[PDB]
Amino acid sequence: DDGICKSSDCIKSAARLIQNMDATTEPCTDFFKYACGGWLKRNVIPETSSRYGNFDILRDELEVVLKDVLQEPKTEDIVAVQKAKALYRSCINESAIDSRGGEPLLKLLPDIYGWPVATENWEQKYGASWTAEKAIAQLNSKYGKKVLINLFVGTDDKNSVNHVIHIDQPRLGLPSRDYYECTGIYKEACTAYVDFMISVARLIRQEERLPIDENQLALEMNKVMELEKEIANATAKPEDRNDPMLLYNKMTLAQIQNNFSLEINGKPFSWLNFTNEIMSTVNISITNEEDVVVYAPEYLTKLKPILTKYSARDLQNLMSWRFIMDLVSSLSRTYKESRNAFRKALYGTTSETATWRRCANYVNGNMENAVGRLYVEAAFAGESKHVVEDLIAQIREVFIQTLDDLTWMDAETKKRAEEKALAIKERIGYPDDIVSNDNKLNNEYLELNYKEDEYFENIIQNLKFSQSKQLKKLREKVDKDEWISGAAVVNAFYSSGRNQIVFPAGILQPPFFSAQQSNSLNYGGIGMVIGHEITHGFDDNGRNFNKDGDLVDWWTQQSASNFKEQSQCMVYQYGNFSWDLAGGQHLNGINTLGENIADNGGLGQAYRAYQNYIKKNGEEKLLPGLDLNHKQLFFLNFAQVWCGTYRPEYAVNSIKTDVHSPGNFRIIGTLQNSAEFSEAFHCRKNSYMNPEKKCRVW
Numbered sequence: 001d002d003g004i005c006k007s008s009d010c011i012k013s014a015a016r017l018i019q020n021m022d023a024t025t026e027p028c029t030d031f032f033k034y035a036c037g038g039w040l041k042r043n044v045i046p047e048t049s050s051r052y053g054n055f056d057i058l059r060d061e062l063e064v065v066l067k068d069v070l071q072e073p074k075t076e077d078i079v080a081v082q083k084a085k086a087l088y089r090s091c092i093n094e095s096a097i098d099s100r101g102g103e104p105l106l107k108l109l110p111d112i113y114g115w116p117v118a119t120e121n122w123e124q125k126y127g128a129s130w131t132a133e134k135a136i137a138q139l140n141s142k143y144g145k146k147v148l149i150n151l152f153v154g155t156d157d158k159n160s161v162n163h164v165i166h167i168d169q170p171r172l173g174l175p176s177r178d179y180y181e182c183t184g185i186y187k188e189a190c191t192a193y194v195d196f197m198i199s200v201a202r203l204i205r206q207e208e209r210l211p212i213d214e215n216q217l218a219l220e221m222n223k224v225m226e227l228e229k230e231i232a233n234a235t236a237k238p239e240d241r242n243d244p245m246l247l248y249n250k251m252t253l254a255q256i257q258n259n260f261s262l263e264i265n266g267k268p269f270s271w272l273n274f275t276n277e278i279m280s281t282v283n284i285s286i287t288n289e290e291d292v293v294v295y296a297p298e299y300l301t302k303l304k305p306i307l308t309k310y311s312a313r314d315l316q317n318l319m320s321w322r323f324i325m326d327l328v329s330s331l332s333r334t335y336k337e338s339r340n341a342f343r344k345a346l347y348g349t350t351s352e353t354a355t356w357r358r359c360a361n362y363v364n365g366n367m368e369n370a371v372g373r374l375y376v377e378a379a380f381a382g383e384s385k386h387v388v389e390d391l392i393a394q395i396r397e398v399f400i401q402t403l404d405d406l407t408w409m410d411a412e413t414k415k416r417a418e419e420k421a422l423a424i425k426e427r428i429g430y431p432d433d434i435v436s437n438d439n440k441l442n443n444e445y446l447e448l449n450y451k452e453d454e455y456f457e458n459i460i461q462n463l464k465f466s467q468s469k470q471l472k473k474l475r476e477k478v479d480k481d482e483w484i485s486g487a488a489v490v491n492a493f494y495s496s497g498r499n500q501i502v503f504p505a506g507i508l509q510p511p512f513f514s515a516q517q518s519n520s521l522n523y524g525g526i527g528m529v530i531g532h533e534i535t536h537g538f539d540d541n542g543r544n545f546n547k548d549g550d551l552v553d554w555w556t557q558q559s560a561s562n563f564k565e566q567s568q569c570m571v572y573q574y575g576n577f578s579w580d581l582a583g584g585q586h587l588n589g590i591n592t593l594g595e596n597i598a599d600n601g602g603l604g605q606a607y608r609a610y611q612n613y614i615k616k617n618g619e620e621k622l623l624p625g626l627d628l629n630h631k632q633l634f635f636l637n638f639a640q641v642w643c644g645t646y647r648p649e650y651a652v653n654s655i656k657t658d659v660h661s662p663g664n665f666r667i668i669g670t671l672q673n674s675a676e677f678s679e680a681f682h683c684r685k686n687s688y689m690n691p692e693k694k695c696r697v698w
């Protein structure tokens, strides 16, 4: 007995670890290169990917399973499954889609008050009866597209069992407000955006047999850009939306009318009319004392002088465009190709992913429980669920025990933190009844009826369905049994309004987890993920919500002040990271703070749980071909979760839009703060990976 594990499962783990690492790099100088340098040398980002790495590879591999389970009818399939497969088949039939051209979009445009640039005599046909209230509400209520003013039904932050109407600033056509500077690194994207507008307007006019005036098209679409630039500059930055206590402003609709008046197309904007135009689609009446949560009061105030300068036509040119730009990829090849330069500018990709991949993901996104059922029956093992349950119990207890060691909280706040940690609701794998209750699964989709030659009608039906569902919830209680993710997902989640952590079946696989892989690897993989999600209940957002999901302050003044002091260290740390792929720009340490807190706390929680495991059960057998002990393998597996790279165009995008740090800096930043990492690899003091100053929250 040489002490070495020689099982097939140890062999597969060892081979993967060996192939990804670059042992010629000193781990204490750059652990990203040490852990991932072999992967980087062997791989090139595919033409269809904006990012590539071990996470993206797992998602690509999950898509293969979805293809296998969606593409073949089975006699015993229940109606829910038949519908998912029919939807899939409608999506992959490009011949049927191509033969329809843009006709499905042409049929639809009268229902959204047209697109003026592709309409003759727009003012007479649609301007005559146009109102901002009706035009915005139509896009919202029927198609789920929120333009200018984002009104939605969501959970009440301060009463987690109830729903309430929210009003917020809208999303933009470009990835973030920064893009609307339209200079330097943003210039290509802005140019491509307007060219994309022009190209689609041109295609529609061609198919409608209208004359093309290239100068007129450019005049109108550049006016769309000038309008959206003003909208973008009026929106609040993410850094100014990160305190949920300050974001929550509840007031009546009468208050909203008194305090946020708008004059659009020369008409006073009626908030009550706007709200009822939306809620009437689900037979719900609204009066002026309805409570509303306004997340963006400053934005509405800034919108007043903006919208007085624009006509109904100018607004509808932007409003319909924001919907159309989403639809062209559901039309014929000619319409699909109009997006090529825009896609390359935002993502760097030169080709769309395989049709069957896009379609598998589309069906999974819209029928998550039907596809989840098919996925787990094909790919998810039995006892896995129970093993992960036990790992969650260990890490939950480690979090609670660590509270005693934390010197920056008083006893009262620690007790409240333990209360919340004990109340976190765990969801593992999949909801049992997507497999065991056919009636319930069929009835979830009963109102959907797909036609296999009508992909466009199918996706439009799905837009209407999911928006009707959302709006109808206004007077209903929150369903505590609902899962915040489908099972066929390679991710994990935390919900502060439900105080719920979820680990879908899709993430319960190597490198994160296998009942047959070494425990060092499981703790460094899924163990860290579990701690990450629990720690989200206590990050700069989650800490503001109590055990029942309510936005209520349970912190003493001193402990809250200390939380900000401790977390400020990480704001500065990650904000000092320069990203070469993003042109040398610095990460946003405020926007990534929550995820960085979760990374740093979660890895430590997982490590301490692994130490307790060894205390109780003894050391594991070593892996063959690796001169690394199991403490070292714990950190190596953590790091290899994040092996990957980015296209420069997408790095410019993600550094502004991603609330996570890039994988390489999740590795460097977290391990820089870990004394245990530097103990395991015997890093000299003030080596790059072992700075004397270390940040710590949880």
Ligand SMILES: O=C(N[C@H]1CCS[C@H]2CCC[C@@H](C(=O)O)N2C1=O)[C@@H](S)Cc1ccccc1
Pocket (backbone or CB within 6 Å): 055, 491, 492, 493, 528, 529, 532, 595, 641, 658, 660
């Ligand atoms: O870090 C997370 N999840 C990531 C998963 C990698 S990709 C990343 C970048 C793009 C935006 C976003 C997306 O997947 O859409 N995203 C995520 O959610 C947390 S919450 C869950 C998790 C934590 C640690 C290991 C594995 C999972």
Ligand SMILES: *[C@@H]1O[C@H](CO)[C@@H](O)[C@H](O)[C@H]1NC(C)=O
Pocket (backbone or CB within 6 Å): 089, 093, 095, 096, 453
């Ligand atoms: C694709 O759609 C066309 C037109 O409806 C139909 O004739 C053809 O059989 C479909 N192909 C498949 C593989 O279902």
Ligand SMILES: *[C@@H]1O[C@H](CO)[C@@H](O)[C@H](O)[C@H]1NC(C)=O
Pocket (backbone or CB within 6 Å): 230, 233, 234, 302
């Ligand atoms: C952007 O918005 C701010 C705040 O309303 C304003 O002061 C500034 O002039 C705006 N910039 C442009 C270019 O409109």
Ligand SMILES: *[C@@H]1O[C@H](CO)[C@@H](O)[C@H](O)[C@H]1NC(C)=O
Pocket (backbone or CB within 6 Å): 131, 133, 273, 274, 276, 277, 280
């Ligand atoms: C909203 O106002 C319009 C007139 O601009 C009116 O035709 C419509 O019936 C109103 N809708 C509701 C729900 O009151």
Ligand SMILES: *[C@@H]1O[C@H](CO)[C@@H](O)[C@H](O)[C@H]1NC(C)=O
Pocket (backbone or CB within 6 Å): 571, 572, 573, 574, 575, 576, 586, 589
């Ligand atoms: C970098 O770190 C220093 C030291 O804490 C801090 O003062 C500075 O603001 C940080 N810079 C960024 C961009 O985060």
Ligand SMILES: [Zn+2]
Pocket (backbone or CB within 6 Å): 532, 536, 595, 598
């Ligand atoms: Zn996270």
